[PDB]
Amino acid sequence: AARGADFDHVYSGVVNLSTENIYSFNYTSQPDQVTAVRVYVNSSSENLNYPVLVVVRQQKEVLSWQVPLLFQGLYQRSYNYQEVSRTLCPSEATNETGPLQQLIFVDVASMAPLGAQYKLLVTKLKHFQLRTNVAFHFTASPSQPQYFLYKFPKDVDSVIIKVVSEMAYPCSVVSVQNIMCPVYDLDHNVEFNGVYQSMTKKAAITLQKKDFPGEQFFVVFVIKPEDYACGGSFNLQRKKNLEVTIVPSIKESVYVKSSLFSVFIFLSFYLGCLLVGFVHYLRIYFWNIITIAVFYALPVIQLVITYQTVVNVTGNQDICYYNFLCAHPLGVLSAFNNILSNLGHVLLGFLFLLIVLRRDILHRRALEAKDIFAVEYGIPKHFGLFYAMGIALMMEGVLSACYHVCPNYSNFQFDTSFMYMIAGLCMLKLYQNASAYSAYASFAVVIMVTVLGVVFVWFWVIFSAIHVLASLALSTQIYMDRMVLLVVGNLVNWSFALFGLIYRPRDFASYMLGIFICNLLLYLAFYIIMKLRSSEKVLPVPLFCIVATAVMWAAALYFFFQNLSSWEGTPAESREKNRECILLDFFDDHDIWHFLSATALFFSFLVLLTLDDDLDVV
Amino acid sequence: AARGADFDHVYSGVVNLSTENIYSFNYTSQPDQVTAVRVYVNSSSENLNYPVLVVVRQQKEVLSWQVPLLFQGLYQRSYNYQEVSRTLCPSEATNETGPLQQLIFVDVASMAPLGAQYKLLVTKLKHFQLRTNVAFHFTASPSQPQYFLYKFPKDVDSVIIKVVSEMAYPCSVVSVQNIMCPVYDLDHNVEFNGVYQSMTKKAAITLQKKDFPGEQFFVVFVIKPEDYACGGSFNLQRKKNLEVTIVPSIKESVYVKSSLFSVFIFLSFYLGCLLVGFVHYLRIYFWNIITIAVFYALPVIQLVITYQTVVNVTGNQDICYYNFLCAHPLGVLSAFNNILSNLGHVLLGFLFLLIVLRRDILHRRALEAKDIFAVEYGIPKHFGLFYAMGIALMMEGVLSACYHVCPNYSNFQFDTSFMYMIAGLCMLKLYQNASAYSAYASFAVVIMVTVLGVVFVWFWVIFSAIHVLASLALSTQIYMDRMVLLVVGNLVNWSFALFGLIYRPRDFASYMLGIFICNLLLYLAFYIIMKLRSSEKVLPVPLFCIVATAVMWAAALYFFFQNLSSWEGTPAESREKNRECILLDFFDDHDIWHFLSATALFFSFLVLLTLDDDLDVV
């Protein structure tokens, strides 16, 4: 019992308590290509107490739905849609089997005393297979989910899928499943299997060839009914216009050609320092700091790899905050362009403990043999702080090379934490004890207290008075021309504190921008303009070094001020600010800061070291 | 078109490509009680290429399934079941509406050239509603999931649901949903809504009355096909015999009657000390430790409340490791019997800084006025360690009262961490500097290194030699009778290290059991048997105190040696060892250790303080 209907035609009729509508669609497959049937069903109006029930029977599948669809959300609201569409599964073919005959049965029924109205349209899909470097243009809906198929090529072993929306809204979920057919297109079971990502404007998924049996996969797009998870708020139709692009990945030569550059650019400094040095006349407090440094590192190297294993096991790519367009994977690590750029700290913090140790050896030898108290400058024994300076670079580099494996909220902002100490020591600038030893750990304690309290009684307005008092206390000791300069510096610090209180950009995230002014104040106390009535204190090598650290600090602020990701306000809003890669397709735009910060801090420390000349001969 | 069949009868027949089987069941509801229809369908044999498809149509629901069910699991295995059963949703009634007429349509069809065989049985449910303090006896299966209904009483505002299996296997999931009917009984969508727990032998769920609209809820039981998540391994039938019990919760009077006891039991010590004291003759290193103590606490009080909020938001009760039969909730906190028992540390660490400060004041006054160098015992100025002893109790109590909000793996075992320092100081026992200051932080560094390295090259065998060397080094300084005692102690320590290496009970969890021997060695060096040829050094008050700290250390080891939970080997195996509550239905069996450890450590420290008598008059 059937009617023998034909494909691509609009059918209408009346259903009742006894009348049932039967349709039978017969089609022949091919020994190649993929076909995909699609059923669209529309209801006229009303029907909120006696809906229409449609069942579709295949050889190895039965599907069923009611036409007046009713969703449900938070805060006791009810949405109702009146249009249903579905994409039936394919059957596939082989080269050893001929053409296949297939039958689809569609039954429509209702349970109403008077009747209902329905419209049926069953059509084949012409464009079902995505190709390499070809962009599509479809349109989704919260009651019309979509899926497509992709086949791996013979040479490509990895693919990046890029999905781009247009306006802002509504949110969606994208999934990557393997080639079977208990296919999951409903919203409540879309997260059961496969890599899935929430997206509101952008999405990027990285896939490999060795993890898929048969080298074919399904990309599934589903639209969220209520945009609550993405951070926003909130009947007739929603609609969405997406765009999907598949691109290949880089080869293996780039992984060598970039690491060779990033390990052959920091030996020219060694060669230069050697050349400059060997041309002359044509020729236990530290011990009690390692035990504290090995206390504040082991929770990081017990939490980070655990989080990485959790992300690499459960499937959810919503726990870490990477840059999803420039995250190259290697091995267990999923970001191998933010762990090889931190190799500058632990290699440029080793030229201090080859020069200042030689200077210590030479000065102690000169004290042992010659009379070092003749024509000297104010107790020449001055070291012991350079050894606690040139090891904080390594203890900042090792601590920075463990945060970029999973940026999250538990790890907080523990990357620019010891840099506050490295820029706020300001002890060796008081050259030529009681209030310094106590304030050494107290400075880092106050910095950590401010960092913790920045997130949580008018913190912005309360900090201006404390900053002004601290600036006045510092300028009282540092400092009439000197009094006028101290007053101008205190006024500038108060104006900067008032401007920061007026701004209040990103609360705890703005702690870096608020302590950059403190670092500038600490690094603007260069007294090189003392030559009004004093000695010369100027030489070509410190003049070149102060020119270099004046020039090379301007460039290192631009890449700081370009924001790429964000650790606040949902994990689906980081993807909007994502950017691509420059400089040989390996380095990011928040990865040329770890190359300039180290080589500016090293030159500033060298300026601090090599200064106070033209007095050893007096 | 129908046949007019009757309830509770076995029907059989043959289906084909053209023949379809229709059944129509008409039933009348009642103005009270709950009915529940249940459909059982059985297939004879074979049918792996042409299955049987069954659809059930109601007024506001359509359900559909194939009879030769096929599941799927990891490692490319395929299971097939031949029996299906389902429980249809109820329709419910009101007191303002009369009896309701309902019709169920059951259609059976196939797509086979020869035929298939099927058996249908549709029956009503007699026992559908659970009652208070009544235990049921049902039987589940991985292809037969179950659900029941419960209604809140008029006085009870909270309920504990206890589910108990029998043997070990197989695992299951239990869910608590609200009263609607898009009911979720399949395995892939059971975790969409509601509180759910994985269970293999035991489960306990706590529910409240203010969170459920209408005061009715659904308890859903579903059996897992593959027992992989619970930790185990791995066709005809599985089967499971459960048991469910609903019990009420305690009143509000217990929350007052226990806190009054647990704050009125620790003032009798104050009254006793006052009475003993006022009866006589009828009458800056510490400053540099607060800055380090406020460094190792803020990640805990940024991670713990975040984890608690995550558990209290997402629904998953599988991230923290509580005792699910003795976890009383109050407010945001879900365990208010492990945060009010840690109030003993921060209240019994305050009787030292009222007695030793008075002794310091009296001794300084006596030095200022009288000649304190007459008839004294070896430089009577001895304090400065009691002030670093009586504040580690508070810095262990505050650090212990933040781990019991969510025991997990990231928090590790950071509860008995400063107790290693508190028991391994052993500095003031060398009475009457160079190697002590260096070894102070080094002892805690070695303890933290051992704790970290215990989890991860024959650690058990390598530690015996290090322990023997450390024991020999300690006994060389501490210590012929003294040499024989030192040799016997070194031999006993080597035997204990060999026994611990032979045992190796729980690796990193066994670090507490392996350092308990070290604590016993440090607290067994009491030289009170020096009276062979020496002075008396014995008085009634230190004799009573050494008797008390000898007696009250035996009882505090039993409750340690009773294990209640475990932080390793899946989060569904902690529930097997769970126990109930003793001592006025509030305190646990791992909560009478925080009351005896403090009052034994305080008496041991008092023994250390008050000793060396009978020499102030000589």
Side-chain angles (χ1 to χ4, degrees), chain A residues 1-283 289-364 366-367 369 374 377-378 380 382-426 428-430 434 436 439 441 444 453 465 470 473 489 497 500 505 509 514 518 525-527 530-531 534-613, chain B residues 1-283 289-364 366-367 369 374 377-378 380 382-426 428-430 434 436 439 441 444 453 465 470 473 489 497 500 505 509 514 518 525-527 530-531 534-613:
Chain A
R3 305 181 208 285
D6 38 358
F7 275 115
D8 215 313
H9 200 15
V10 173
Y11 285 114
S12 60
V14 153
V15 281
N16 209 343
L17 187 52
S18 306
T19 326
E20 196 192 6
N21 281 172
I22 315 297
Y23 298 118
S24 153
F25 294 114
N26 44 348
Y27 71 105
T28 181
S29 181
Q30 300 278 359
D32 253 358
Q33 287 84 241
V34 202
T35 58
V37 201
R38 177 146 180 116
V39 170
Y40 163 90
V41 162
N42 189 353
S43 167
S44 172
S45 58
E46 43 268 1
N47 297 357
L48 243 190
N49 38 5
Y50 294 115
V52 182
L53 318 151
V54 176
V55 290
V56 171
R57 305 196 318 247
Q58 322 175 58
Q59 172 164 346
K60 294 212 201 263
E61 225 188 15
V62 153
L63 198 68
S64 58
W65 65 84
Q66 41 161 352
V67 189
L69 257 196
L70 289 103
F71 281 71
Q72 211 155 6
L74 277 83
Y75 293 170
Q76 263 49 243
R77 275 202 220 90
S78 285
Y79 318 112
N80 56 317
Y81 303 99
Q82 288 191 355
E83 291 186 61
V84 194
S85 268
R86 286 292 252 279
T87 310
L88 311 182
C89 262
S91 40
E92 301 256 12
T94 60
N95 208 4
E96 65 216 60
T97 314
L100 302 185
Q101 294 283 116
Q102 266 91 356
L103 257 78
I104 302 278
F105 268 92
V106 175
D107 304 346
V108 172
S110 166
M111 205 156 258
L114 295 99
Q117 272 84 2
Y118 79 121
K119 309 266 189 179
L120 182 105
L121 173 47
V122 189
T123 166
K124 218 174 300 180
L125 268 202
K126 318 187 180 306
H127 271 148
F128 196 41
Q129 191 168 358
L130 296 178
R131 326 206 88 96
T132 301
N133 281 354
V134 152
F136 214 66
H137 264 168
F138 56 92
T139 165
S141 180
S143 83
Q144 301 176 0
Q146 301 233 4
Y147 68 74
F148 295 100
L149 165 81
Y150 192 43
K151 288 191 175 186
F152 270 89
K154 304 212 61 63
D155 314 320
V156 160
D157 289 13
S158 185
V159 280
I160 288 202
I161 308 179
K162 289 174 185 167
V163 191
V164 167
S165 169
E166 176 46 68
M167 203 157 306
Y169 270 171
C171 293
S172 324
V173 185
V174 288
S175 291
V176 176
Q177 290 151 351
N178 60 54
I179 173 185
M180 291 305 167
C181 257
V183 58
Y184 296 141
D185 42 4
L186 290 173
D187 42 16
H188 54 255
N189 53 356
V190 78
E191 331 167 270
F192 192 43
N193 274 4
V195 182
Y196 64 98
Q197 288 195 6
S198 72
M199 145 202 168
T200 172
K201 202 173 304 181
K202 293 208 208 183
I205 310 181
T206 309
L207 297 179
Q208 299 260 353
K209 191 181 190 177
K210 107 193 183 303
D211 220 317
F212 278 95
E215 278 98 311
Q216 315 165 60
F217 59 93
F218 278 147
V219 187
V220 185
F221 310 89
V222 60
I223 311 298
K224 196 165 301 306
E226 269 179 358
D227 31 0
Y228 263 124
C230 318
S233 45
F234 200 94
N235 201 338
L236 251 179
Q237 270 307 341
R238 298 273 287 242
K239 287 293 178 178
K240 193 172 181 54
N241 312 290
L242 291 96
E243 163 165 356
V244 50
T245 315
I246 319 277
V247 286
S249 198
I250 66 178
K251 263 296 150 203
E252 192 74 351
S253 302
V254 180
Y255 274 88
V256 167
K257 201 199 312 298
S258 175
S259 178
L260 166 138
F261 160 77
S262 168
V263 86
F264 273 20
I265 171 56
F266 284 150
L267 257 67
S268 175
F269 283 167
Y270 282 17
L271 186 82
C273 94
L274 208 142
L275 180 80
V276 167
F278 275 67
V279 85
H280 287 180
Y281 207 8
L282 312 183
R283 71 185 179 121
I289 304 304
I290 303 298
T291 175
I292 310 177
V294 299
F295 265 3
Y296 218 61
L298 275 312
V300 178
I301 331 179
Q302 93 196 53
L303 185 58
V304 167
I305 321 91
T306 304
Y307 274 168
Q308 163 80 11
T309 299
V310 161
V311 172
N312 236 39
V313 160
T314 193
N316 216 2
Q317 285 196 1
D318 265 347
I319 324 179
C320 304
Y321 289 61
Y322 299 119
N323 190 11
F324 275 113
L325 274 91
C326 216
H328 291 356
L330 165 139
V332 47
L333 294 174
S334 185
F336 205 54
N337 57 351
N338 309 136
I339 278 165
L340 205 151
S341 99
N342 284 350
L343 183 93
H345 294 359
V346 310
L347 177 66
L348 216 51
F350 205 66
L351 244 186
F352 271 18
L353 301 63
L354 174 146
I355 285 183
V356 82
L357 186 132
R358 216 278 311 266
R359 204 170 268 231
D360 185 274
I361 285 303
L362 187 67
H363 148 69
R364 280 197 300 122
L367 181 53
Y377 190 84
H382 212 190
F383 308 129
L385 216 40
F386 289 124
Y387 299 109
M389 274 182 168
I391 215 59
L393 214 48
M394 316 213 180
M395 192 39 24
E396 159 64 24
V398 157
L399 252 194
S400 189
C402 275
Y403 163 69
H404 285 316
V405 198
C406 184
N408 203 339
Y409 194 11
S410 306
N411 315 56
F412 211 63
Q413 33 259 56
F414 276 14
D415 56 315
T416 63
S417 277
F418 278 0
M419 183 144 299
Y420 287 169
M421 161 184 298
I422 291 167
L425 282 163
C426 203
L428 185 44
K429 204 63 164 303
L430 199 68
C518 198
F526 289 130
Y527 60 108
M530 162 85 98
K531 300 164 299 180
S534 181
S535 173
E536 300 161 300
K537 300 191 177 185
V538 279
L539 222 68
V541 167
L543 186 66
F544 162 70
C545 287
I546 198 67
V547 152
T549 188
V551 152
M552 182 156 307
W553 260 124
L557 274 196
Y558 195 16
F559 302 127
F560 193 29
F561 278 165
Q562 306 281 59
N563 200 27
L564 291 202
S565 81
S566 168
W567 59 281
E568 80 256 40
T570 67
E573 291 204 31
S574 99
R575 295 159 208 274
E576 300 194 50
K577 317 170 178 178
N578 280 347
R579 216 193 303 281
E580 221 158 359
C581 323
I582 73 180
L583 193 76
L584 303 153
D585 321 319
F586 212 112
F587 290 130
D588 201 335
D589 221 297
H590 192 285
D591 209 57
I592 327 186
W593 183 54
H594 299 142
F595 277 178
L596 286 171
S597 100
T599 199
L601 256 180
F602 162 73
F603 270 71
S604 152
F605 282 358
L606 203 87
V607 158
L608 205 34
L609 175 132
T610 206
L611 214 47
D612 304 298
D613 310 79
Chain B
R3 305 181 208 285
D6 38 358
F7 275 115
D8 215 313
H9 200 15
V10 173
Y11 285 114
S12 60
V14 153
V15 281
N16 209 343
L17 187 52
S18 306
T19 326
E20 196 192 6
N21 281 172
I22 315 297
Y23 298 118
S24 153
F25 294 114
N26 44 348
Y27 71 105
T28 181
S29 181
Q30 300 278 359
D32 253 358
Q33 287 84 241
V34 202
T35 58
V37 201
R38 177 146 180 116
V39 170
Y40 163 90
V41 162
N42 189 353
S43 167
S44 172
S45 58
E46 43 268 1
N47 297 357
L48 243 190
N49 38 5
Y50 294 115
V52 182
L53 318 151
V54 176
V55 290
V56 171
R57 305 196 318 247
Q58 322 175 58
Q59 172 164 346
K60 294 212 201 263
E61 225 188 15
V62 153
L63 198 68
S64 58
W65 65 84
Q66 41 161 352
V67 189
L69 257 196
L70 289 103
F71 281 71
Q72 211 155 6
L74 277 83
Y75 293 170
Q76 263 49 243
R77 275 202 220 90
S78 285
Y79 318 112
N80 56 317
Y81 303 99
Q82 288 191 355
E83 291 186 61
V84 194
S85 268
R86 286 292 252 279
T87 310
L88 311 182
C89 262
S91 40
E92 301 256 12
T94 60
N95 208 4
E96 65 216 60
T97 314
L100 302 185
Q101 294 283 116
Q102 266 91 356
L103 257 78
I104 302 278
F105 268 92
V106 175
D107 304 346
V108 172
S110 166
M111 205 156 258
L114 295 99
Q117 272 84 2
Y118 79 121
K119 309 266 189 179
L120 182 105
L121 173 47
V122 189
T123 166
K124 218 174 300 180
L125 268 202
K126 318 187 180 306
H127 271 148
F128 196 41
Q129 191 168 358
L130 296 178
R131 326 206 88 96
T132 301
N133 281 354
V134 152
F136 214 66
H137 264 168
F138 56 92
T139 165
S141 180
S143 83
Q144 301 176 0
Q146 301 233 4
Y147 68 74
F148 295 100
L149 165 81
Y150 192 43
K151 288 191 175 186
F152 270 89
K154 304 212 61 63
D155 314 320
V156 160
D157 289 13
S158 185
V159 280
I160 288 202
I161 308 179
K162 289 174 185 167
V163 191
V164 167
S165 169
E166 176 46 68
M167 203 157 306
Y169 270 171
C171 293
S172 324
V173 185
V174 288
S175 291
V176 176
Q177 290 151 351
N178 60 54
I179 173 185
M180 291 305 167
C181 257
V183 58
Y184 296 141
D185 42 4
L186 290 173
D187 42 16
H188 54 255
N189 53 356
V190 78
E191 331 167 270
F192 192 43
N193 274 4
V195 182
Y196 64 98
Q197 288 195 6
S198 72
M199 145 202 168
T200 172
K201 202 173 304 181
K202 293 208 208 183
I205 310 181
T206 309
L207 297 179
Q208 299 260 353
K209 191 181 190 177
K210 107 193 183 303
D211 220 317
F212 278 95
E215 278 98 311
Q216 315 165 60
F217 59 93
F218 278 147
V219 187
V220 185
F221 310 89
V222 60
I223 311 298
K224 196 165 301 306
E226 269 179 358
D227 31 0
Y228 263 124
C230 318
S233 45
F234 200 94
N235 201 338
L236 251 179
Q237 270 307 341
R238 298 273 287 242
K239 287 293 178 178
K240 193 172 181 54
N241 312 290
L242 291 96
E243 163 165 356
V244 50
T245 315
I246 319 277
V247 286
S249 198
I250 66 178
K251 263 296 150 203
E252 192 74 351
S253 302
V254 180
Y255 274 88
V256 167
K257 201 199 312 298
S258 175
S259 178
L260 166 138
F261 160 77
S262 168
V263 86
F264 273 20
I265 171 56
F266 284 150
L267 257 67
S268 175
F269 283 167
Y270 282 17
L271 186 82
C273 94
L274 208 142
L275 180 80
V276 167
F278 275 67
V279 85
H280 287 180
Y281 207 8
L282 312 183
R283 71 185 179 121
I289 304 304
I290 303 298
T291 175
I292 310 177
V294 299
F295 265 3
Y296 218 61
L298 275 312
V300 178
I301 331 179
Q302 93 196 53
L303 185 58
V304 167
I305 321 91
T306 304
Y307 274 168
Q308 163 80 11
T309 299
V310 161
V311 172
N312 236 39
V313 160
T314 193
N316 216 2
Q317 285 196 1
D318 265 347
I319 324 179
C320 304
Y321 289 61
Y322 299 119
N323 190 11
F324 275 113
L325 274 91
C326 216
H328 291 356
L330 165 139
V332 47
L333 294 174
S334 185
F336 205 54
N337 57 351
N338 309 136
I339 278 165
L340 205 151
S341 99
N342 284 350
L343 183 93
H345 294 359
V346 310
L347 177 66
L348 216 51
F350 205 66
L351 244 186
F352 271 18
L353 301 63
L354 174 146
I355 285 183
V356 82
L357 186 132
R358 216 278 311 266
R359 204 170 268 231
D360 185 274
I361 285 303
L362 187 67
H363 148 69
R364 280 197 300 122
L367 181 53
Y377 190 84
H382 212 190
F383 308 129
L385 216 40
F386 289 124
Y387 299 109
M389 274 182 168
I391 215 59
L393 214 48
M394 316 213 180
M395 192 39 24
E396 159 64 24
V398 157
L399 252 194
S400 189
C402 275
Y403 163 69
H404 285 316
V405 198
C406 184
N408 203 339
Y409 194 11
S410 306
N411 315 56
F412 211 63
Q413 33 259 56
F414 276 14
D415 56 315
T416 63
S417 277
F418 278 0
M419 183 144 299
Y420 287 169
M421 161 184 298
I422 291 167
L425 282 163
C426 203
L428 185 44
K429 204 63 164 303
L430 199 68
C518 198
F526 289 130
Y527 60 108
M530 162 85 98
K531 300 164 299 180
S534 181
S535 173
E536 300 161 300
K537 300 191 177 185
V538 279
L539 222 68
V541 167
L543 186 66
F544 162 70
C545 287
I546 198 67
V547 152
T549 188
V551 152
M552 182 156 307
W553 260 124
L557 274 196
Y558 195 16
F559 302 127
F560 193 29
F561 278 165
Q562 306 281 59
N563 200 27
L564 291 202
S565 81
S566 168
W567 59 281
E568 80 256 40
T570 67
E573 291 204 31
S574 99
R575 295 159 208 274
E576 300 194 50
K577 317 170 178 178
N578 280 347
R579 216 193 303 281
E580 221 158 359
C581 323
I582 73 180
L583 193 76
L584 303 153
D585 321 319
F586 212 112
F587 290 130
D588 201 335
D589 221 297
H590 192 285
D591 209 57
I592 327 186
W593 183 54
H594 299 142
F595 277 178
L596 286 171
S597 100
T599 199
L601 256 180
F602 162 73
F603 270 71
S604 152
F605 282 358
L606 203 87
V607 158
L608 205 34
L609 175 132
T610 206
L611 214 47
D612 304 298
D613 310 79

